Amino acid sequence: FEAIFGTFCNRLEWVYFLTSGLAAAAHAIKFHDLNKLTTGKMLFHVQVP
Amino acid sequence: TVSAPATYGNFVLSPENAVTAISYHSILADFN
Amino acid sequence: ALRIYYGDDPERYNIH
Amino acid sequence: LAEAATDSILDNPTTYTTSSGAKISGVMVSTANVMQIIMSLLSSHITKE
Structure with missing residues (x-):
């Protein structure tokens, strides 16, 4: 005979955004898509010392 | 006898700047 | 309206 | 490099704080080999918290 031994899958490691170090470089927010933020660029009045 | 308005109209504010202001509060730190 | 539009x-x- | 970065408008001070009250002020990221060289060269400054 030939002996087909045990079979093996590969457990790929999942990786999340919020569990990563890049998440400290952002402010990630799930937000429902609107037209109002896209039809207009924002304006910011930043005060300079 | 024609039916003119009683006084002037008073302006309304649209309910779309509400979802503009909430979407701009979402960029900031917290609503509460 | 105060917490809503102004922040x-x-x-x-x-x-x- | 860490000093030359400037600040931002909407910075949240209650996010990405570590234990013992210290504050994370950014994140640097490289390849695996450069990270291993930095770890093996600067082991007197790298903790695990």
């Missing part, structure tokens, strides 16, 4: 925190940002 949560009056410091370090305002909605103008």
Whole structure:
């Protein structure tokens, strides 16, 4: 005979955004898509010392 | 006898700047 | 309307 | 490099704080080999918290 031994899958490691170090470089927010933020660029009045 | 308005109209504010202001509060730190 | 259009925190940002 | 970065408008001070009250002020990221060289060279400054 030939002996087909045990079979093996590969457990790929999942990786999340919020569990990563890049998440400290952002402010990630799930937000429902609107037209109002896209039809207009924002304006910011930043005060300079 | 024609039916003119009683006084002037008073302006309304649209309910779309509400979802503009909430979407701009979402960029900031917290609503509460 | 005060918390809604103008914002949560009056410091370090305002909605103008 | 860490000093030359400037600040931002909407910075949240209650996010990405570590234990013992210290504050994370950014994140640097490289390849695996450069990270291993930095770890093996600067082991007197790298903790695990």
